[PDB]
Design a protein around this ligand. Structure first.
Ligand code: SF4
Length: 73
């Protein structure tokens, strides 16, 4: 539905700014939700869907990141 914008730390060590998570060892450079293997599509104003149950709950910032990130490679 009209899922609300994800909070920083909604779940899974998520950040709204990918760069915030530089502190997180698994935050490799330039990993963004937009380039996550579990990305859905962009919905509005730099937010889009993350296609996992404990995630799609909220609309994630395309520029965000989380621990469940897997590279689309
Ligand atoms: S799995 Fe994480 S990094 Fe990937 S799109 Fe979802 S919230 Fe973003």
């Amino acid at each position: 539905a009209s899922e609300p914008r994800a909070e920083d730390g909604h779940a899974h060590d998520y950040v709204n700014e990918a760069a915030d998570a530089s502190g997180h060892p698994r935050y490799q450079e330039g990993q963004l939700c937009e380039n996550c293997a579990f990305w859905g599509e962009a919905v509005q104003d730099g937010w889009g869907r993350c296609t996992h149950p404990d995630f799609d709950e909220v609309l994630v910032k395309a520029e965000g990141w989380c621990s469940v990130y897997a590279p689309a490679s």
